[PDB]
């Protein structure tokens, strides 16, 4: 059964050292990725979020690093080796989207688009300093429900791509206007107009670029 990343329970994003850690099970049918490595960034201490982050890493088990990061900016690596992060990198940000508006959700794991950009910019420098690694992403995949407007023209993803650039991270951003879930193979599902979970519905996502 799919569990949406659309909120519904209380946000717990503080004190990373007190978060659950879940097992990543490598799946062997992940195929090829354009990214040489990736960071899965788990943004809150919630079972749906933690499982989704672990399942994404399991799709590319040899080149994925999972980080948990809290409201104070403290982070820890819970899967993978940062030394694999060389080349064309993606970050997949995993959290619940919440706080609806005319342009859909306004917060991912409690963070506005501006706040999220600041957090990620600090994290890039902290991670690079502590791990001695350039983790600079080319692409951010926002793995949370309904973080761009239905027509794909407004909302969180648009404010986020600009705020990221303002904070020194020029990235492409993929983001979904619908509810979103991650399955046991690390593949994403969105909800269609009928409320049914589907895969590869390109109409539910947009890739914002420069
Ligand atoms: O090649 P596929 O097996 O079809 O997997 C794709 C691919 O991810 P991989 O890197 O794991 O191959 C996409 O990556 P892009 O190069 O297009 O960026 C990703 O898109 P996002 O990066 O935007 O997350 C997409 O996810 P989506 O379902 O949202 O299209 C995902 O497909 P799966 O969901 O089946 O893993
Ligand atoms: Na692929």
Residue numbers in the entry: 3583 to 3792
Authors' description from the paper:
V. vulnificus secretes a large multifunctional-autoprocessing repeats-in-toxin (MARTX) as a main virulence factor via an atypical type I secretion system. The central region of the MARTX toxin of V. vulnificus MO6-24/O contains an autoprocessing cysteine protease domain (CPD) and four effector domains including the domain of unknown function (DUF1), the Rho-inactivating domain (RID), an αβ hydrolase (ABH), and makes caterpillars floppy-like domain (MCF). The CPD directs the proteolytic processing of effector modules after activation by binding to the eukaryotic cell-specific inositol hexakisphosphate (InsP6). The V. vulnificus MARTX CPD displays a canonical CPD structure with the central seven-stranded β-sheet flanked by three α helices.
To examine the activated conformation of the unprocessed CPD upon InsP6-binding, we crystallized the pre-processing form of CPD (here referred to as pre-CPD) bound to InsP6 using the catalytically inactive mutant C3727A. We determined the 1.3Å crystal structure of the CPD-InsP6 complex capturing the scissile bond harbored in the active site. The N-terminal five residues (TKEAL, 3583–3587) upstream of the scissile bond were ordered in the crystal structure. The side chain of the scissile residue Leu3587 is inserted into the catalytic pocket formed between catalytic residues His3678 and Cys3727. The Cβ atom of the mutated Cys3727Ala points toward the amide bond of the scissile bond, which represents the conformation ready for the catalytic reaction. The backbone of Leu3762 in β9 makes a hydrogen bond with the amide nitrogen of the scissile residue Leu3587. InsP6 binds to the conserved basic pocket located distal to the substrate binding pocket. Three positively charged residues, Arg3769, Lys3770, and Lys3782 of the β-flap make ionic interactions with InsP6. The β8-β9 loop of the β-flap interacts with the β7-α3 loop locking the catalytic residue Cys3727 in an active conformation. The binding affinity of InsP6 to the pre-CPD C3727A was 1.4 ± 0.5 μM measured by isothermal titration calorimetry.
